[PDB]
């Protein structure tokens, strides 16, 4: 997250880190046994770390659970990033509490102009690398579909939504994929892609979670 602020300790209790040796992607806890993230964060072995604030220090609040099943959306396209969503079933249910909590799935699609909270442990710089120890947060608006299309002509599908500021300065970056974009208490986006980090007229584009609520619920039931 470039141009954001340190999140207050465990103000984001649904945020998880996906770890395979080091942190490579975020995700969101949607119920005590399932995590939603981006399909491009797929790895065959993933450990989910819940209740994290400082990713590099054992604080004693964390729960570390291995992924038992990882299910990518059946229509994920590796090149256009259409349908970039993945579900992870935890080996055992987590212990829900102060620091580890669920985020609600959306009621409807949020309209352009809604403010959203994005969080992650990704790179903090637009040029150069500086990975934070502590979770970063950013407040940014869902942009209108037309501006999204004008920034990335031909690459935006109806399953994508742009968030950010077209004059740049703030945005998610490498290490933030799979993380939550929560707008009014509901998970509306999943961090996916953008050109550069926080560059003028290249906003962030997220997977539009409101198009997948029934696929999510039906997959958790069959599994």
């Amino acid at each position: 997250i470039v141009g954001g602020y340190t999140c207050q300790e465990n103000s984001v209790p649904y945020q998880v880190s996906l770890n395979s040796g080091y942190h490579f992607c975020g995700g969101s806890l949607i119920n005590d046994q399932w995590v939603v993230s981006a399909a491009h964060c797929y790895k065959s072995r993933i450990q989910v770390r819940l209740g994290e604030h400082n990713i590099n220090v054992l604080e004693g609040n964390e729960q570390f659970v291995n992924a038992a099943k990882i299910i990518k959306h059946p229509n994920f396209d590796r090149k256009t990033l259409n349908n970039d969503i993945m579900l992870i079933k935890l080996s055992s249910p987590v212990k829900l509490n102060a620091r580890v909590a669920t985020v609600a799935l959306p009621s409807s699609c949020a309209p352009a102009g809604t403010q959203c909270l994005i969080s992650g442990w990704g790179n903090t710089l637009s040029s150069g690398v500086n990975e934070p120890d502590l979770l970063q947060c950013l407040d940014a608006p869902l942009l209108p579909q037309a501006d999204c299309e004008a920034s990335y002509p031909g690459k935006i599908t109806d399953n994508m939504v742009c968030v950010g500021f077209l004059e740049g300065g703030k945005g998610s970056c490498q290490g933030d994929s799979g993380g939550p974009v929560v707008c009014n208490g509901e998970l509306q986006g999943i961090v996916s892609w953008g050109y550069g980090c926080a560059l003028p007229d290249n906003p962030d584009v997220y997977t539009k979670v409101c198009n997948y609520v029934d696929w999510i619920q039906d997959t958790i039931a069959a599994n």
């Binding site: 080091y22 942190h23 490579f24 992607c25 981006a38 491009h40 964060c41 590796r78 090149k79 990033l81 990704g122 790179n123 690398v129 990975e131 998610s172 970056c173 490498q174 290490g175 933030d176 994929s177 799979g178 961090v191 996916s192 892609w193 953008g194 050109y195 980090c197 962030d204």
Partner: protein, 51 residues
């Protein structure tokens, strides 16, 4: 393999190797997770061989 390392548009942090031409070796860089170019390898030995 003379081409610069390409992080790509995706926002994951995946440590990969590229051959740094003007240095003569394979070094690590952060790959974003999609649209990989060819100077991008999962091991140092893979990288050294192919160069």
């Amino acid at each position: 393999a003379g081409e610069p390392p390409y992080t790509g548009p995706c926002k994951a942090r995946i440590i990969r190797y590229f051959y740094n031409a003007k240095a003569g070796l394979c070094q690590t860089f952060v790959y974003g997770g999609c649209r990989a170019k060819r100077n991008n390898f999962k091991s140092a030995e893979d990288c050294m061989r192919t160069a």
